[PDB]
Structures are given as structure tokens and as C-alpha cells.
């Protein structure tokens, strides 16, 4: 498969919106396996992110933070290995996305079935729905001994229920294609 190298920018503000998006597009276009951390930060509402759509594996951690963009197209992401972790604890960190209102509306991690190491931190995403419905224990791998969670569900909009097609009312978004594969 096509591999790319990840970043280690964490929450630092980029030097320029243009050079930032250009760097991410050139890094991840066509990429399937990120050998490193997938950090997606400070992206504005009009950001074109189709270049992420082939990512299937992240070897480090995924950080989605300080974005106004309403969707992040990671529907093909199947595994986060967590060989590096955000704050040495979290394999998936979704932070401060927000503030039509800006801000991530759904995670839409339809293919995510395994986190091998590290936990899940979801904080201060005022338009984010459904993150409380996910059974994270079905995603943490059996040898993941940092399977800790903090899922902030405070939000500023009312969420429509998971699709009635979804078993156990667990979903990554409103669509019947967004049910959690359990």
C-alpha cells in the first residue's frame, strides 16, 4: 500500500493557513498508511479534505483539534496502532472543534474497528453528536492496557437519534451507513 510519514505538530498554530493545508494535502494525498501521527488541526470551514479519503491505518495517534470544518473524511480508517500517543495516553483525541455554526458534527469513523494502544479523549466540540453512543470497549484491542476514556457530551444542538437501522443505537453519524460495526 502507499505509506506516508506523519507529523508531530500537536496543537501549535500553523504559520499560514495556505502553507498548512498545502503541507497536509501534499503529505497525505493517496496515502493509505500513516507511519506516524495523523494531526488535523486549525482547518477552516471551506477546507477541501478529500486528500484524506484513502487513509486506512495510522501507526501513531489521531489528533483532530481546533477545526471549524464540519466533517473530516476518515470513513476508511480501520486501525490506530498508538505506537506514539497524544500526551502519552490517547490514541484518538478530538478537541476544541467549534467556536451555520462551525465545528465537527459527526466523527463518521465507520471503518474504525481497532485501537491497539492508548485511549480516547473527546472534549469541547459543541456541534458534535453520537460520540457517547459508541461502545469503545469493542474497539480497544485486547492487549490495549491504556484503554482510558473521557467523552465530553456537552453540545449546543439537539442530536437526531441514530438511524433505526443501527443495532444497539450505536452510530458514528445520522446515516444508516454510520452504524457501529460491532
Amino acid at each position, epitope marked *: 500500500t502507499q505509506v506516508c510519514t506523519g507529523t508531530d505538530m500537536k496543537l501549535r498554530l500553523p504559520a499560514s493557513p495556505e502553507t498548512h493545508l498545502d503541507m497536509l494535502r501534499h503529505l497525505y494525498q493517496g496515502c493509505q498508511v500513516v507511519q506516524g501521527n495523523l494531526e488535523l488541526t486549525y482547518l477552516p470551514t471551506n477546507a477541501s479534505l478529500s486528500f484524506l479519503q484513502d487513509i486506512q491505518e495510522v501507526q501513531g495517534y489521531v489528533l483532530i483539534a481546533h477545526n471549524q470544518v464540519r466533517q473530516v473524511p476518515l470513513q476508511r480508517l480501520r486501525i490506530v496502532r498508538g505506537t506514539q500517543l497524544f500526551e502519552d495516553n490517547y490514541a484518538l483525541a478530538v478537541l476544541d472543534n467549534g467556536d451555520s455554526p462551525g465545528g465537527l458534527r459527526e466523527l463518521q469513523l465507520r471503518s474504525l474497528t481497532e485501537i491497539l494502544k492508548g485511549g480516547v479523549l473527546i472534549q469541547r466540540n459543541p456541534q458534535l453528536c453520537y460520540q457517547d453512543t459508541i461502545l469503545w470497549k469493542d474497539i480497544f484491542h485486547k492487549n490495549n*492496557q491504556l484503554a482510558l*476514556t473521557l467523552i465530553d457530551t456537552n453540545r449546543s444542538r439537539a442530536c437526531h437519534p441514530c438511524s433505526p437501522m443501527c443495532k444497539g443505537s450505536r452510530c458514528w453519524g445520522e446515516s444508516s451507513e454510520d452504524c457501529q460495526s460491532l
Partner: antibody, heavy 120, light 112 residues
């Protein structure tokens, strides 16, 4: 040197709640997870859960879900464990212990234990 | 849940002899080239103290009379030579899964 200083022994009535505190010093408190562990008298050690002080992520033993709640107070470098709805079977020594990532998540520094007596 | 079974539950060893304590796990505690097995000493009325981490690593400050060996489902703590200060209960503990579990403990009586 690293020290974990726990609050003193507690006498609590059945049905009440108790707060056990664990004050950390000698290292960066928010850089390490904190384990909580139960030991009934003459029995083995049981894992209750662990917490990340920096962002508050937690992992609980299912056996203690809803008996124990872990929190931190960063300003005082303190981890706290609240035990609720107490029964005779909750009378035990409760320990906090630091998680060491490099040492395979071993419990490398322990508090001195807080003895809780549940009784009328 | 990985169940840890320590053997023997108690033993009496004289000063200068070797003490051997075994920890048998119900399934492998190995992953990513690590054995996630640790050993602790608990004297009566005290907290446990870490002796050995990751099956064979001696914790800094612990006397080299203590050693750990083993892999997969079978681990051993050796104390050689036994000294009076070793009177204590010894526990193994694993974290190859998020659910941490401990052995039932082995009580070491010093034979004088």
C-alpha cells in the same frame, strides 16, 4: 524523592460515602496516570481503576464501576477516590499508586494506604 | 480476565537458602515483545513495593538478591540468599490487558 501521601483512616456509617485523597510530590503530577487499588484485610490486592490527571481520562474495573469515582485536583497535586453507598464489604485499605509507562505500566510508587471502616 | 495463580501459597525458607515463587497465568501476558508481569513485596501494615518489572527487570534500589524470569504464562521470582528482612507477602501482577489482576499472594516465613 517521589512521595504519595494519603489521607488518614476513615470511619463511615453504612450507606454513606467517603473521599480518599492522595497527594503527589517529587514529580510532574499530570505526566503520570494514577492507579487505585483495594485490599481487604488478609486478602489480595484488587485493581479499582486509573486516571490521567492532565485531561481526566479514566479506566475502571467493571467490578467497581459506580462504587468508585476517580477525580483529580491539579492545583493541589491530589488524586481523589470517592466511594459511595458504603457497606461492610467496602471496609478495606485503599491505595493510590503511580503508573510508570517505561516500566511496563508497573505500580512503581505507592501511597501508605487509607483504612476505611464501614460501621454503625 | 487473566487469572494469576501463585505457587506455593506459603513457604518457609532458612536464612541463606533460595526462595522460589511461581506465577502461572491463565493465558499469555506477553505482547509487543514484552512480558507484562511485575512482582511486589508487601510487609505487614505497609504498601506493596515494586521489586521486578516487565518479568525480569530489577527495580532501582532493590537488592540483586531478587530476580525474575519466565515468559508467556509461567513466571518465577527468586530470592537468593534469603535474609530476615524478606519476611513478607509477595504478589505477581499483570497488565497485558486493561483489566489489571494480581496473584493471591505468597507468604514467605523465615525459618530460624
Amino acid at each position: 524523592e517521589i512521595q504519595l501521601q494519603q489521607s488518614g483512616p476513615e470511619l463511615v456509617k453504612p450507606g454513606a460515602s467517603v473521599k480518599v485523597s492522595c497527594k503527589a510530590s517529587g514529580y510532574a503530577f499530570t505526566s503520570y496516570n494514577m492507579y487505585w487499588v483495594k485490599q481487604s484485610h488478609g486478602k489480595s490486592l484488587e485493581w479499582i481503576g486509573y486516571i490521567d490527571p492532565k485531561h481526566g481520562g479514566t479506566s475502571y474495573n467493571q467490578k467497581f464501576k459506580g462504587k468508585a469515582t476517580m477525580t483529580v485536583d491539579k492545583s493541589s497535586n491530589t488524586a481523589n477516590m470517592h466511594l459511595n453507598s458504603l457497606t461492610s464489604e467496602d471496609s478495606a485499605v485503599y491505595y493510590c499508586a503511580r503508573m510508570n509507562y517505561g516500566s511496563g505500566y508497573a505500580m512503581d510508587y505507592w501511597g501508605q494506604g487509607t483504612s476505611v471502616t464501614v460501621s454503625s | 480476565n487473566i487469572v494469576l495463580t501463585q505457587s506455593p501459597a506459603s513457604l518457609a525458607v532458612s536464612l541463606g537458602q533460595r526462595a522460589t515463587i511461581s506465577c502461572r497465568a491463565s493465558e499469555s501476558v506477553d505482547s509487543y515483545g514484552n512480558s507484562f508481569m511485575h512482582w511486589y513485596q508487601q510487609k505487614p501494615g505497609q504498601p506493596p513495593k515494586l521489586l521486578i518489572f516487565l518479568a525480569s527487570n530489577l527495580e532501582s534500589g532493590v537488592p540483586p538478591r531478587f530476580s525474575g524470569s519466565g515468559s508467556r504464562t509461567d513466571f518465577t521470582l527468586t530470592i537468593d540468599p534469603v535474609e530476615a528482612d524478606d519476611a513478607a507477602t509477595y504478589y505477581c501482577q499483570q497488565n497485558n490487558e486493561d483489566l489489571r489482576t494480581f496473584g493471591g499472594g505468597t507468604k514467605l516465613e523465615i525459618k530460624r
